[PDB]
RNA sequence: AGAUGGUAAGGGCCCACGGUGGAUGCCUCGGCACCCGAGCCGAUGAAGGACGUGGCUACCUGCGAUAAGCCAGGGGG
């Protein structure tokens, strides 16, 4: 995923409430599973999308953790 | 009547060239000694591990279900 898009994901991410974050993760986590399935049947040529989503879920959770910790 | 050479089944010594084998010289990502710097870690769960972790991954390295990585500051180009 693009550098600029990362920064953009973070800005909008840091504006969410934990619940919105929790909900957002669950969907991107669901999208990861959808990706894995098509990856299974050789129907995902844009395979970089898998690594990409994994780190989004990472970046979200990191921020979810940010929200809670002080 | 007498006498003396060509035979090499195979073998021996020398010479040429190969095979095998990995000495020798050169080489060094490693080691060895001395000197200096530096010296604790852990229930806020250590040292050391197990099992996992990649779109395709046997192993090593890294990492821990956020899993060859996540956030921020500094360095760099
Ligand atoms: Mg990043
Ligand atoms: Mg004769
Ligand atoms: Mg002969
Ligand atoms: Mg013969
Ligand atoms: Mg002889
Ligand atoms: Mg020879
Ligand atoms: Mg020499
Ligand atoms: Mg000393
Ligand atoms: Mg020490
Ligand atoms: Mg350990
Ligand atoms: Mg688990
Ligand atoms: Mg920087």
Swiss-Prot record:
BP terms from Gene Ontology: translation
Keywords per UniProt: Ribonucleoprotein, Ribosomal protein
UniProt-listed Gene3D superfamilies: 1.10.287.310
PROSITE patterns: RIBOSOMAL_L29
InterPro entries: Ribosomal_protein_uL29, Ribosomal_uL29, Ribosomal_uL29_CS, Ribosomal_uL29_sf
GO terms of molecular function: structural constituent of ribosome
Gene Ontology cellular-component annotations: cytosolic large ribosomal subunit
Similarity remark: Belongs to the universal ribosomal protein uL29 family.
Function: One of the proteins that surrounds the polypeptide exit tunnel on the outside of the subunit.
Assembly mode: Part of the 50S ribosomal subunit.
PANTHER family: 60S RIBOSOMAL PROTEIN L35/50S RIBOSOMAL PROTEIN L29, LARGE RIBOSOMAL SUBUNIT PROTEIN UL29C
Name under which the protein is recorded: Large ribosomal subunit protein uL29
Source lineage: Bacteria, Thermotogati, Deinococcota, Deinococci, Thermales
């Amino acid at each position: 995923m693009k550098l600029s898009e990362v920064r953009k994901q973070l800005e909008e991410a840091r504006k969410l409430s934990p619940v919105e974050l929790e909900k957002l993760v669950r969907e991107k986590k669901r999208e990861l599973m959808e990706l894995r399935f098509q990856a299974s049947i050789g129907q995902l040529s844009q395979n970089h999308k898998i690594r990409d989503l994994k780190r989004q879920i990472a970046r979200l959770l990191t921020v979810l953790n940010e929200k809670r910790r002080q």
